[PDB]
């Protein structure tokens, strides 16, 4: 037991190194796509359905990112407590949570709570790839779009009952010592008008800014979901390292 926990601690240290490397590798593309999105938003009309809040919100998708392995000490517990807080806030605002899950631990938790999970993805929590994030973001965005024509409890012309909001509840890797579960509204996105300062030479948009913005917003959402998954993987590795250190101390 003691030897196993010590070995797991060292392996978790190596995994933390790998996860931090992955986050750093992902950073440049995120920065560049954010810059392009800012340019297109400055050039295009800010009226995308992903960018406009639905009136009378009545459903909110929530993606809870958890781990597959339970050797992490309180990582899943903190994530699920934050998810419960977000559910309470959504109910207070009058919205029904529509639950999506990443990882088996949250699946078991919500199965015990007997809360229906619309869709779940498992098996990649430790080393998530961009394809998993793209699939998750595509499902979430499709659900968000399906909610445009929904009223009350009727799916409308879609035939699919969507959601009016998208939130992500994952563990943010603040540092090696601190990893805090956070809730982030992935959609609808708000517009933060920063002071203009760049404007001396115009960008050329092919074919036109509106279609470029239309195509790039879903990609931005997928990129942010991928970043959240990477942060969750790093946080899970850190918390597993801490849990194994504590177990070795106990043993």
């Amino acid at each position: 037991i003691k030897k196993i926990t010590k070995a797991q601690e060292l392996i978790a240290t190596s995994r933390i190194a790998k996860a931090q490397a992955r986050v750093e590798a992902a950073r440049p593309y995120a920065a560049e796509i954010t810059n392009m999105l800012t340019e297109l938003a400055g050039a295009s009309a800010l009226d995308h359905p992903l960018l406009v809040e639905r009136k009378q919100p009545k459903r909110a998708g929530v993606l809870v990112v958890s781990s597959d392995r339970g050797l992490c000490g309180a990582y899943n517990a903190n994530v699920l407590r934050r998810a419960e807080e977000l559910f309470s806030l959504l109910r207070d605002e009058g919205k029904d949570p529509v639950l999506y899950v990443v990882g088996r631990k949250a699946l078991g938790y919500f199965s015990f709570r007997q809360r229906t999970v619309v869709e779940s993805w498992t098996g990649f929590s430790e080393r998530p790839t961009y394809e998993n994030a793209r699939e998750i973001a595509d499902t979430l965005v499709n659900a968000f779009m399906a909610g445009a024509d929904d009223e009350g409890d009727d799916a409308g012309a879609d035939g699919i009952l969507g959601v009016d909001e998208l939130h992500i509840v994952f563990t943010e890797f603040r540092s090696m010592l601190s990893q805090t579960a956070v809730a982030r509204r992935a959609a609808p996105m708000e517009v933060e008008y920063v002071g203009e300062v760049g404007p001396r030479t115009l960008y050329s948009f092919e074919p036109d800014p509106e279609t470029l913005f239309d195509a790039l917003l879903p990609r931005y959402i997928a990129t942010r979901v991928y970043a959240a998954l990477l942060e969750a993987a790093a946080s899970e590795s850190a918390s597993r390292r801490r849990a194994m250190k504590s177990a070795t101390d106990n043993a």
């Binding site: 999105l37 938003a41 807080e85 509204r185 959609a187 708000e190």
Partner: peptide, 23 residues
Amino acid sequence: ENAEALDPEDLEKESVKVRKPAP
């Protein structure tokens, strides 16, 4: 379970920066 509601301030919202004057 009646869990405490998350503070709306604590919730962080994704935003799209625009280098334009405020409307």
